[PDB]
């Protein structure tokens, strides 16, 4: 029925899904043990929805594999002392990004975040090497706060809200050269809806940031949106 | 050197919209528009701009893209509304259309328009025959215990996207009678990826009192599976 | 029905189907009414052949709606006096011009040619300023026949016969500065069979007649077809 | 003012058959015909010239494209006609072709065209050994009789598509055995576009007769779909 | 199953099981669709599209594209000698033949192959085709052939040491406007050695070149065409 | 020029590549930092070889990261104490998987084999739980010499030869219920290329071994190829 039920509003989980929590893929409409006497005979595409199907030690991933490839590529050359996503969900980025600098012998510290931190889905005793912090993005005391952190640093924006003053400041007062700001998803979206503003936003820092062309192209996510510094 | 000499501002405000809602036409940058025929074969091939909301009615901007306007037309045609409504109107292009084209085809229908915002709203007063603007928000329902028993038949637009199946549920408890449509553009298939189970029973909730009408159904990528009538 | 049935040659339906009074699609393969708790399980595709599918106002329409959406543009940015359609079918598209102009406010005068408005199908009173004329193109007292035009004006070539000549006489005849002169979906098939005879001949208008590259690529229908008076 | 008194020829004359009758191979625009091998990766990759009807056989022009070619010999391999019409000739270049693949073949296959047309033919009178030409109309059936009952088996082959199912009709009550091809190369597909409801009633007509062959019918994008032949 | 013994399914890669011309089967649907129901009737082939070609009841794997081309090719060089390194079951031979024969050629075609046994043509057929058993590594199964007419066609579909066997050809063979070619293979070894093969390649500037009206005219001969130049 | 060199039979490069060691991109048409004054007319493009770009800790990666994400969520469901890669080229998937168990918290022990060792690249630093053998799969004593290892287990078949004869010694001998034995790459070419073997062969085992169709369909390398162990 319609009449006794009340409804959340659908909005709050694009680009996420429901739950933050891992769900195992089941098989509704075949066996998994497919018998073989009949191999042609068995349907080809997935099996379940390809929405954010990715895992990584039971959570969740909102980054697909061939961003995860740029990263991995990206990590392996920079060795970055400093990896501060803004922007956290389930946190299954932070638990990746921890676990790949740390077999990359890279002794890094991994820095969420979010002002809601409470849909993170990590074990309590599995945060060796990770800082969370509250705070909204209008305010730049946040950002302030890790400002004695060790370098090279890959800041990745996750939220990207007022996204462009805090780029501003970064400049003017965090990124030493070849540092990573890199701004998840949305770039193109932006070009798309407001095109004269957007390039003449970005034109502004013609001479401290710049698109670095050997990632910007190597991901749907990523899609040129990965930023570097410059020596003026 | 332009970074620091600008106060920037926030661009997710755009998104699905567009800086400026006064319509501006095309203009050319590669080429010019006089292509000489002696050179026929060399032209261009592309466009030349923006193919994003390139759309227009009467010198005011229109959202809806060409297919999405013909659907309408034969919707229009078929029913013969005596009511229209547009919950969301931005540049309220899409409110002179409705209303030209009832006008055109004999129909004595109200078009009605329900924003937050109408400052954005662009029609020239001296030709808004038939048309109203309420202000309010799609939160509470108040915004709609004043919509009149208008005419039937009637149709029901979504462009907002909030609270709206709440606002689902007071229309069909409260408004639409057979052969009403209540048509959700735009969203659906984005709420049918980020929530295949919940939106799936939301909207099934409705089985009794909805159907989706299949005849326009699959006929545009705005529309798509998106417009539901009654059968009572 | 081999040995009874006698047949209609069925070339004559290239390009605009059987009837020319429109008729709206019904389903086969479905209920109009799908059911919401199995909205995930309902077919995707549109479920009616998309030949020629549109329409205005109970009218068959032949350009579909992104060139529908074109000449809106044109006409918006124009405001022209005249349209002279070259072959009418239903003159479906004769009843949208004059439909749309109205609405613009613009005083404009559509005008169908053709050998035969014999399928016609504008209802007698749905008329105002539309003028019929009947002659084949391969006669170019089709062309002189017709009294003096006010401008701006478009021309619009859908016969695809003997259209170079009738490009020869509206370019000293008729056209003015401005003016369009615009044939629909053949330009690229005459390129295709005929690329060095198709050139030489439009190649002669260089100096009286140019592409107007802001419509000339914005549908199938006017794909590099879309000419007007450079002067 | 190159207009003013040049002779413009009717350009629909030249629907899919070209300017030529006459057999020219094709030219280089762009780019030289060798090309240097140090430079052999800055080659281009497209074709060079028109694709429109690049192929031939002998120094005659060939409308049958190499994918209708193949079907055409396996059903002659099959069938070892007596017997092949073809209905529309132009350059007389598919005449040669059947002809010259029956003998190699080593069977025995008079080939015969028909058209009222017959200036366009290409092939030289030296060669022109078991081919038999028609002056002829469509529309009279008169055309057909003198066809003085050729050996069978046989393959009637439609290339002018007027007055067909009249001729369909004649073939049928006249001319065809068990197991002979009656054959509309490309139409069928317009026709269905174009008429659909008389189209499927016309075709309906023959049931008891004739049969679609799936194996050569889904076989080439020419002969698609319109591949025929006598049941019983 | 447990005493079987399998054989290595990479013998049969782009050849299949049988060198044996056989016809395809339907399976799912009849043969003789019915007219009543022509619009159900499926679209799709009906069958596997690996290799179904064949010549005179002999395979043909040089697919239709392929066969216009050399085609061409031999019709405008009338070549007296053409050379297939690959043999399988010979059905590019004698086609190659065939053609030749309705065009008034006179022409010798040779094939050449380590493994000669999985060749179909009957010896009722073998008319100025010529066999040969020798291997590509050893460059002495192929000075045999120097007392052979031009102009000459030779095609690689061997792909075993091809860069010194072209290399003795363009030394102790191919006249000027000869042919040699690479079927299928040049684009995996730019694939899979960019570097190394535009070096094995470039090599030959100062006596070959890429004829380019027949290069990019088909899948299996992409930018493998290759004549002599002019010394 | 070319009657001096000597050429690597480029074959032996098929699927691999020239060198074995990783080496990065490196753009030739773009300077790595586009300014953001001009960000719109960037390149779209990557900038170099989509052959195999993709690498783990400065050695080179075959699998690409689909292909990755496959054998992960495998390896954190089965948790296998032994992984066992046929082929080896490079020493890049054995490294992987030891790095991956290792961090899942398995103790799981990878195992490589090849009939050539010299090409790897995995420094000595860096070789725990990895084990290598020399052999060919021709001779199936290279797997009699294998030791006893603990499950679950994954049998991976990486370098396909004999790859269905060594299956029925693996089912024989080695595998137990819910190892997997993943063919990756070649089974949907060995359908193409031989059907009616590629069943008789595969079918053969229907009695031991299933397609596990949850991993099975998620990636174009592991496409079809994904078998396990079940009674
Ligand atoms: C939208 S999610 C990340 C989704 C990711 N961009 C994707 O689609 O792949 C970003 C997180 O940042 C938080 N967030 C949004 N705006 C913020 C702000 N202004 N300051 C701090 N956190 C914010 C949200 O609560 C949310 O959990
Ligand atoms: C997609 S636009 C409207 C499109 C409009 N029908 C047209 O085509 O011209 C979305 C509109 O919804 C309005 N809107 C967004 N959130 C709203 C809310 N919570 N309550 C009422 N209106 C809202 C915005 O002001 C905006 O004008
Ligand atoms: C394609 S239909 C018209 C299309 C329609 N007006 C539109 O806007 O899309 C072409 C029309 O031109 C007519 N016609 C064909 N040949 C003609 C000729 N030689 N002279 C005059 N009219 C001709 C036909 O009778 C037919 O009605
Ligand atoms: C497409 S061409 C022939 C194609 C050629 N047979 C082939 O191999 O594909 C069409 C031919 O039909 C002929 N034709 C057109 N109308 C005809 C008619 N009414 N009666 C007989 N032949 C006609 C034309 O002269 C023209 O040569
Ligand atoms: C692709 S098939 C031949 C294709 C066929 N001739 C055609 O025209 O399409 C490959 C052939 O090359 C032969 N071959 C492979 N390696 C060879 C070598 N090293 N020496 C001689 N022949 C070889 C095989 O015996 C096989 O017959
Ligand atoms: C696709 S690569 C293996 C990639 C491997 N998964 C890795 O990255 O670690 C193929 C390998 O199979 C090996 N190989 C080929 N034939 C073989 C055979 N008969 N016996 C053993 N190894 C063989 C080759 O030497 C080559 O190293």
Request: proline letters at 6%; hydrophobic letters at 40%.
């Amino acid at each position: 029925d319609y009449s006794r039920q009340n409804f959340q509003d659908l909005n709050l989980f694009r680009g996420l899904g429901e739950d933050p929590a891992y769900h195992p893929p089941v098989l509704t409409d075949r066996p998994r043990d497919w018998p073989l006497d009949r191999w042609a005979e068995a349907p080809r595409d997935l099996g379940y929805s390809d929405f954010s199907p990715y895992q990584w030690r039971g959570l969740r991933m909102l980054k697909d594999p061939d961003t995860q490839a740029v990263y991995h590529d990206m990590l392996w050359e920079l060795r970055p002392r400093t990896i501060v996503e803004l922007g956290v969900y389930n946190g299954g980025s932070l638990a990746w990004f921890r676990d790949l600098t740390k077999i990359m012998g890279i002794d890094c510290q991994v820095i969420g975040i979010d002002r809601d931190l409470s849909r993170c889905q990590i074990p309590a005793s599995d945060m060796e090497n990770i800082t969370l912090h509250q705070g909204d993005c209008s305010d730049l005391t946040t950002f302030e706060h890790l400002r004695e952190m060790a370098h090279p640093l890959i800041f990745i924006d996750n939220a990207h809200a007022n996204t462009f003053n805090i780029m501003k400041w970064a400049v003017d007062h965090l990124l030493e050269e070849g540092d990573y700001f890199i701004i998840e998803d949305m770039i193109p979206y932006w070009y798309r809806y407001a095109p004269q503003l957007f390039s003449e936003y970005l034109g502004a820092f013609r001479d401290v940031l710049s698109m670095d062309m050997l990632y910007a192209n190597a991901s749907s996510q990523l899609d040129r949106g990965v930023l570097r510094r410059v020596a003026a």
